[PDB]
């Protein structure tokens, strides 16, 4: 299991079973419930609605140590210990770190390098990716990567995928690749409709594929002991990288993701401190992104980020399409119209789980065509995550601070990076090219 | 014993000129000078007389009269003990509230009264307070003198008294003393 | 569940009653509607005087005194108690040594058993009921029309309209039936 | 509008059975055992007096805790928040409302079968609206002298009532 | 065991004079050395009943003595106890713990300091000053006293001390007569 | 001199979510390096109010800052005082007996290790290892800091700032007005 | 927390056996034969008092030769370490440590069958750590006014209020 319920806590208060859009909370108006772990997609809003909190000054419970070996959590965290606990995956972490022979490697999203600031008593939303680099050099990781990278690689591949389809329309109305919970729920009840999601691999898949059978052929490492782990905002990504059909270059492309908070576990027991650590720079060969990629966080931000390109794809001809703010919002569905190469696209996006199955229906789909769906399951985008600390209970600083650093980088549009034209011109050749169908694509097809 | 009966029912009234630890668990204290208590008794006979809480079929069917007390407890007046002791007079109207409608009540004395040089009057009126209200002859009720040693009621039926011989007879009874003559010895 | 027939005894017009039994107790009491004098309804007395028979403190064992204390005896004892002291007083001063108090609240074979039973066993007519004290009315009907008792019938009173002439009237409080 | 019970003085005895079935049928559902239906005796006529369903109550705009509410066509005392506050006795104009203690029993043959059977609270006439049966005093009397007059009743009495006095005054003269 | 009487006011004889709160005052307080004289009131004035007067007049309120008394269930310590026919608060175990004021509807019971002997009662341990000792005032029904004295105080003769017994019979008799007169 | 306010609990529209605890135990500590986020929080969490759930339903309890109050006639150091318009334990003054304990009926108050800078206490003189200082914590009302934060932070509004005067006139005024429309 | 021993007042006779039961006790085992637990007459109530085992120890604060530390869940004297510094006598708020001597007792009972029976250290209720058996002070009482305390005790009875007022205050108003 991977979202439990402890029994001895939960007091039957109902309210994180107001907040999951499946409803996989079965229980009565008193007493604890449990989690249908059948059908539940792992988005996390349930965790941190959630605020049993039972101390450890009565021994009428466990002992509190003990309970540090079940939630999986380091020993040395003494933070209190809530009900709607995530699994913990740092004690592996640690025990990789302490072998000296495997070439060890990082990824980075982006919402960590806003997300952390806030676990040492900063401001919240503070963009921190120099302090974030040096620490995480300082936790004996040998390499250090960014998964934008690999965003950059899946806006190209949607973008062709999305300029192909638009061409002899066969399901049209296409969808993102992006939240594995979307695709979770699409295969749990809306099996007929699967197809309609492009076949594109979230970015930490790419980048780990990358980093597997590409990043070890531009080092001295054979691809047999490397320890690749994702940072990642989610209690969502355990699940993606777990699939049997997950894996590439023989062996598992990601090996086990820690959120945010585990991180920040990690950073604690180790004793460093995070305001004295000074700013670095991630590794060149596959560190080197565009704001384009770096907007993923909030919501919508892969509406941009396609476009960009897309907008060079079809009409061939370099006009400005850098900001759009009629597709910016936190809630609900929102919809716009494009004019691109003498062709109108509708497009929307949709924050939230609920808000798709309006627009899903096959007479609905039939009614407004949907030319683009950009779909997040948590609210608000992936800054708003299972994986984000606790509020004690904000968000806008969070959006805030990564659309300035969208606005600080020089590079803009998807399409400049030469880290991309160097591995299209190198190792893929070009997209849709015989290569990216084994490294970048998979089928959707558990069939649930 | 007495504090164990305080099982949420009891109701303890105890008058003392001094302080000891009873006075301070009672919820009603009857502080009176020493001396002064046969004033009290009075007062308290004729409280519960005026209020009509006397059983007169104790009285009617074993004692020989009524009027006897009542002419000698109608002189003093409630008032009249009021500022006879400087007490207040209220605390008599409820302590005759809790003694007459409850049925079984105990009196208990110590040492105090009983190194009196008028203790007689004290005790005859003890008495008739006790058979007024009909508090004699049933378990939990009565009359209860406390005795200041441990063998004194062993002193008592036989003979420790210069007028008195075993078995609660007096030796100037000529019956009795012609009663053991021989079996006694000498 | 079973449905008894009997006449409620707590007055003497005498009506029909269901003593609605459950599990060997009685647990209601029902009006017959094909009764002559009740036509199906019944005073306070025959809807609730049930409550009487299965009451915690009813006398289940006999006992006798023997110090001034009753204590539970058997029965042969006591019968044999019964007959030798009833057979000592009869040796000494005959058979006027009791007087025989047949209740009124009792069916006509008690009543026939007491009698037989003080006459035809010890030989006395000291037999007497404590519902005399309407006494001088059976003496006076007699000596007038030569009749000891009620003369008509109580739902003849009802069938056609007559003139109703009450004496004493406190039939309202008394037999609430035939006031009805 | 409201369902009430009516009781006519010219067929009832005094007999007491009515109190007394009121009082035990609503012991035995599990009730306060007390009667709501008192016996008045004057000076010309004895009838029993209940709770006329006041159709504005005076009651329920009286009631602090609002424990006094209308439910289906009656007005029903809900005892359970019931405090004791004797308000509601002030504003009831017939005395229909008096309350759970023993001394509230006059002397009479129910005071002797319920004490030779063995809270405090406001106890009303409920209408006898649980028990599938209609009202235990109109059942149960001897003379059947209440009677439950309903919302159609009281038009049909009416209308009966004009229709003969418009007929009478037809035929005798106009 | 019987209804206990509770006073009632009477806004249609009632003016709003506050004459039937100095007499309580006045007949309360008299180990404060009170000789039915101003000039030797040393102390600062409590009454029991409030006067409350609104658009459609003015009246007095004051407890109702209920039976189920929630004032009397809410007090944890036991203060309130129904010690004679009328319910009665006891000033020694008080701590003001003021649920008495979130229990009553009415509103009879009112927190105010006490005064012993013409002098302000002091605690313990509290502030750097002293705290004076607050009490739940409420009307007592002048149990330990004689009649009340909010009665024969009264100039127009508002006040009424009802029991709920007679009040019903004479209601039940007067529906009697009005209903058998037209029958 | 003005009676002391304090906060109560609705039971009807209460669910136990313990979000009222947690944000006491987060407004308060914040000399304890909390920075409104769990993970900056390296203490025990201690909150000052405590949920109940019984057969019918839960509801927390908290202080009810009485007027005489016997926390503070308790203590012999006098450790309790009325700082404001409520009623503070200091944590600077307190031996760390137990009659503090045996006094108050609510039971809102509870002994345990006082944490200053994010670590434990240490005393000097005991036993080979030191016995942390632990001292009494019970409801303030926040008197230091602002509004109260149970209020503000409940979902469903349960709880509620009560002045106990205010309530009583209001209580009369209505008594009133419901006695004037129907008499 | 620590366990000490409290007495309610309102079943305290002063028969003077308790304060005896504790002297004699601590005798026999080769102690300071002085009695622990103390005798006071107040003008409302007779009450005794002893040490209350301050869970913070003001008394180890000020003992300059360190002879005062916490065994098991009790506070110790150590009567071989302790020089008569009355400074530990000026910081106990409850007064509940006097001294070795003989002028030191009150003329009663004890004094006297003392004296028909028949080093000054500072002495101190040790709550009987030394015997098998509960404190000699609660076992011997002849009304059992003393009882001892512990954690559990404390958290059952505070769980036990709590609940009390709880269900109360749901019965009778929200
Ligand atoms: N993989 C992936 Fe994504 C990327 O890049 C994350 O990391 Fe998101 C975030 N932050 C999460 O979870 S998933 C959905 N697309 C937008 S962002
Ligand atoms: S993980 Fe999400 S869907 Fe599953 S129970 Fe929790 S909140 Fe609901
Ligand atoms: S939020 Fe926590 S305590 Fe409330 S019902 Fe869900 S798991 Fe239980
Ligand atoms: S928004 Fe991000 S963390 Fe949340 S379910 Fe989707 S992919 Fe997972
Ligand atoms: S009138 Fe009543 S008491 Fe008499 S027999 Fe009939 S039911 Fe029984
Ligand atoms: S049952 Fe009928 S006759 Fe008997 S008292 Fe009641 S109303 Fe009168
Ligand atoms: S006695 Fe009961 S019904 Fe009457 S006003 Fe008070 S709470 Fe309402
Ligand atoms: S109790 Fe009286 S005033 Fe109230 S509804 Fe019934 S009859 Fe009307
Ligand atoms: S209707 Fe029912 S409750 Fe009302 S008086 Fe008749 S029997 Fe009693
Ligand atoms: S204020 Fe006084 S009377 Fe009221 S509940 Fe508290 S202690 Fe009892
Ligand atoms: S104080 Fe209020 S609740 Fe208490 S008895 Fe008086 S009126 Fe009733
Ligand atoms: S009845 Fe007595 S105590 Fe109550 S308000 Fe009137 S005068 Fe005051
Ligand atoms: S004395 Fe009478 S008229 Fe004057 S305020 Fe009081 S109740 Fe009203
Ligand atoms: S716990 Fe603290 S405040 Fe309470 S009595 Fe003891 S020293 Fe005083
Ligand atoms: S701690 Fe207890 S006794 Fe002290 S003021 Fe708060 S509720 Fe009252
Ligand atoms: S008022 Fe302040 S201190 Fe008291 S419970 Fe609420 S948040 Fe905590
Ligand atoms: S926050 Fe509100 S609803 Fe939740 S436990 Fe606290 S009082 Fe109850
Ligand atoms: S043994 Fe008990 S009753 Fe005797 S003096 Fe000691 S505490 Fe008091
Ligand atoms: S008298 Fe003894 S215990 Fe007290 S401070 Fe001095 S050495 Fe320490
Ligand atoms: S001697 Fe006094 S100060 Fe020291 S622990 Fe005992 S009670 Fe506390
Ligand atoms: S615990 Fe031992 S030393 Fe302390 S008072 Fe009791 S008998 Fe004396």
């Known amino acids: 299991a991977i979202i439990n319920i402890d029994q001895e806590l939960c007091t039957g208060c109902r309210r994180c079973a107001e907040v999951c859009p499946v409803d996989a909370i079965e229980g009565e108006k008193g007493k604890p419930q449990k989690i249908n772990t059948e059908v539940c997609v792992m988005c996390g809003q349930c965790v941190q609605k959630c605020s049993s909190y039972a101390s450890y000054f009565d021994e009428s419970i466990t002992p509190r140590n003990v309970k540090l070996q079940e939630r999986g959590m380091l020993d040395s965290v003494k933070e209190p210990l809530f009900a709607a606990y995530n699994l913990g995956y740092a004690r592996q972490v640690k025990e990789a770190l302490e072998n000296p022979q495997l070439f060890k490697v990082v990824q980075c999203a982006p919402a960590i390098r806003v997300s952390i600031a806030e676990e040492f008593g900063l401001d919240l939303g503070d963009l921190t990716p120099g302090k974030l680099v040096a620490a995480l050099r300082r936790l004996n990781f040998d390499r250090v990567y960014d998964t934008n990278f690999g965003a950059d690689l899946t806006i190209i591949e949607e973008a062709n995928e999305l300029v192909k389809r638009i061409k002899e329309g066969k399901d049209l109305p296409m969808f993102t690749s992006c939240c594995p919970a979307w695709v979770k729920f699409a295969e749990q009840t809306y099996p007929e409709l699967l197809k309609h999601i492009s076949t594109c691999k979230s970015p930490q898949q790419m980048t780990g594929a990358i980093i597997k059978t590409y990043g070890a052929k531009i080092n001295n490492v054979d691809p047999a002991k490397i320890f690749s782990v994702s940072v990642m905002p989610c209690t969502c990504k355990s699940y993606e990288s777990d699939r049997p059909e997950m894996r590439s270059s023989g062996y598992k492309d990601v090996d086990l993701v820690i959120t945010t908070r585990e991180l920040a576990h990690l950073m604690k027991d180790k004793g460093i401190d995070f305001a004295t650590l000074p700013d670095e720079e991630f590794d060149s060969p596959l560190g080197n992104y565009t704001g384009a990629?770096?907007?993923?966080?909030?919501?919508?931000?892969?509406?941009?980020?396609?476009?960009?390109?897309?907008?060079?794809?079809?009409?061939?001809?370099?006009?400005?399409?850098?900001?759009?703010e009629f597709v910016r919002g936190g809630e609900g569905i929102r919809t716009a119209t494009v004019q691109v190469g003498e062709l109108e696209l509708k497009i929307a996006v949709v924050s939230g789980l609920k808000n798709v199955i309006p627009i899903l229906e096959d007479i609905k789909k039939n009614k407004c065509d949907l030319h683009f769906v950009e779909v997040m399951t948590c609210p608000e985008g992936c800054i708003s995550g299972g994986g984000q600390p606790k509020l004690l209970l904000a968000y806008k600083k969070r959006k805030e601070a990564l659309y300035k650093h969208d606005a600080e980088l020089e590079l803009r549009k998807s399409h400049?990076?030469?880290?991309?034209?160097?591995?299209?011109?190198?190792?893929?050749?070009?997209?849709?090219?015989?290569?990216?169908?084994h490294l970048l694509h998979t089928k959707y097809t558990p069939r649930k | 014993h007495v504090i164990k009966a305080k099982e949420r029912g009891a109701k303890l009234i105890v008058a003392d000129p001094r302080m000891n630890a009873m006075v301070h668990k009672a919820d009603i204290w009857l502080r009176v000078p020493s001396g002064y208590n046969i004033p009290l008794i009075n007062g308290m006979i004729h409280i519960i007389i005026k209020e009509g809480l006397v059983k007169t079929?104790?009285?009617?069917?074993?004692?020989?009269?009524?009027?006897?007390?009542?002419?000698?407890?109608?002189?003093?007046?409630?008032?009249?003990?009021?500022?006879?002791?400087?007490?207040?007079?209220?605390?008599?109207?409820?302590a005759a509230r809790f003694y007459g409608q409850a049925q079984a009540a105990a009196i208990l004395y110590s040492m105090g009264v009983t190194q009196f040089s008028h203790g007689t009057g004290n005790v005859v009126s003890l008495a008739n307070l006790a058979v007024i209200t009909g508090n004699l002859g049933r378990p939990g009720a009565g009359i209860c003198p406390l005795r200041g040693q441990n063998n004194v009621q062993g002193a008592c039926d036989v003979g420790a008294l210069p007028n008195v011989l075993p078995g609660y007879l007096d030796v100037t009874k000529e019956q009795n003393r012609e009663r053991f003559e021989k079996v006694w010895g000498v | 569940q079973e449905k008894v027939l009997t006449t409620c005894p707590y007055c003497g017009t005498g009506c029909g009653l269901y003593l609605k039994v459950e599990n060997e107790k009685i647990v209601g009491v029902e009006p017959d509607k094909l009764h002559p004098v009740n036509q199906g309804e019944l005073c306070i007395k025959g809807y609730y005087g049930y409550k009487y028979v299965h009451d915690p403190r009813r006398l289940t064992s006999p006992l006798i005194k023997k110090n001034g204390k009753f204590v539970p005896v058997s029965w042969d004892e006591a019968l044999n108690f019964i007959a030798n002291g009833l057979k000592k007083i009869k040796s000494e001063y005959g058979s006027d040594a009791?007087?025989?108090?047949?209740?009124?609240?009792?069916?006509?074979?008690?009543?026939?058993?007491?009698?037989?039973?003080?006459?035809?066993?010890?030989?006395?007519?000291?037999?007497?009921?404590?519902?005399?004290?309407?006494?001088?009315?059976?003496?006076?009907?007699?000596?007038?029309?030569?009749?000891?008792a009620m003369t008509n019938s109580i739902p003849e009173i009802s069938t056609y309209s007559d003139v109703i002439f009450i004496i004493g009237s406190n039939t309202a409080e008394c037999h609430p039936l035939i006031a009805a | 509008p409201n369902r009430f019970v009516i009781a006519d003085p010219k067929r009832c005895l005094g007999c007491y059975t009515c109190i007394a079935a009121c009082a035990f049928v609503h012991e035995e559902q599990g009730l306060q055992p007390f009667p709501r239906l008192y016996l008045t005796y004057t000076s010309e006529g004895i009838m029993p007096?209940?709770?006329?369903?006041?159709?504005?109550?005076?009651?329920?705009?009286?009631?602090?805790?609002?424990?006094?509410?209308?439910?289906?066509?009656?007005?029903?005392?809900?005892?359970?928040?019931?405090?004791?506050?004797?308000?509601?006795?002030?504003?009831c104009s017939f005395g229909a409302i008096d309350f759970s203690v023993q001394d509230s029993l006059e002397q009479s043959i129910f005071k002797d079968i319920k004490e030779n059977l063995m809270r405090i609270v406001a106890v009303k006439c409920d209408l006898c609206n649980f028990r599938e049966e209609g009202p235990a005093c109109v059942q149960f009397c001897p003379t059947k002298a209440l009677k439950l007059v309903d919302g159609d009743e009281i038009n049909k009495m009416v209308k009966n009532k004009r229709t003969v006095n418009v007929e009478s005054l037809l035929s005798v003269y106009g | 065991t019987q209804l206990n009487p509770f006073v009632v006011a009477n806004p249609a004889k009632c003016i709003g004079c506050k004459a039937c709160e100095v007499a309580c005052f006045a007949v309360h307080n008299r180990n404060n050395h009170v000789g039915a004289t101003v000039g030797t009131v040393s102390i600062p004035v409590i009454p029991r009943l409030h006067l409350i007067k609104t658009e459609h007049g003015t009246m007095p309120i004051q407890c109702r003595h209920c039976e189920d008394a929630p004032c009397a269930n809410v007090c944890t310590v036991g203060a309130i106890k129904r010690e004679g026919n009328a319910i009665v608060v006891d000033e020694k175990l008080c701590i003001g713990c003021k649920s008495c004021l979130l229990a009553c509807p009415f509103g009879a019971i009112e927190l105010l300091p006490q005064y012993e002997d013409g002098r302000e009662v002091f605690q313990i341990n509290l502030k750097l000053v002293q705290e004076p000792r607050?009490?739940?005032?409420?009307?007592?029904?002048?149990?330990?006293?004689?009649?009340?004295?909010?009665?024969?105080?009264?100039?127009?003769?508002?006040?009424?001390?009802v029991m709920p017994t007679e009040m019903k019979k004479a209601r039940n008799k007067e529906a009697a007569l009005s209903f058998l007169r037209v029958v």
């Not at chain 2, 020989?64 to 009021?82: L, S, W």
Request: aromatic share 6%.
């Open chain 1, 416 to 437: 400049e990076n030469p880290a991309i034209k160097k591995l299209y011109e190198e190792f893929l050749g070009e997209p849709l090219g015989k290569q990216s169908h």
């Open chain 2, 57 to 94: 079929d104790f009285v009617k069917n074993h004692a020989v009269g009524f009027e006897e007390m009542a002419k000698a407890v109608e002189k003093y007046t409630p008032e009249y003990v009021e500022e006879l002791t400087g007490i207040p007079k209220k605390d008599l109207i409820k």
């Open chain 1, 293 to 324: 990629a770096t907007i993923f966080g909030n919501t919508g931000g892969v509406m941009e980020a396609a476009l960009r390109t897309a907008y060079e794809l079809i009409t061939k001809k370099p006009i400005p399409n850098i900001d759009i």
């Open chain 3, 98 to 148: 009791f007087a025989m108090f047949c209740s009124a609240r009792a069916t006509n074979e008690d009543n026939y058993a007491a009698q037989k039973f003080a006459r035809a066993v010890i030989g006395i007519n000291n037999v007497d009921h404590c519902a005399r004290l309407h006494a001088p009315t059976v003496a006076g009907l007699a000596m007038t029309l030569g009749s000891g």
């Open chain 5, 134 to 161: 607050i009490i739940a005032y409420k009307c007592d029904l002048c149990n330990d006293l004689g009649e009340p004295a909010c009665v024969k105080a009264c100039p127009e003769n508002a006040l009424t001390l």
């Open chain 4, 49 to 91: 007096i209940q709770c006329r369903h006041c159709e504005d109550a005076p009651c329920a705009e009286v009631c602090p805790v609002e424990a006094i509410k209308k439910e289906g066509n009656a007005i029903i005392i809900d005892e359970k928040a019931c405090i004791g506050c004797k308000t509601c006795l002030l504003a």
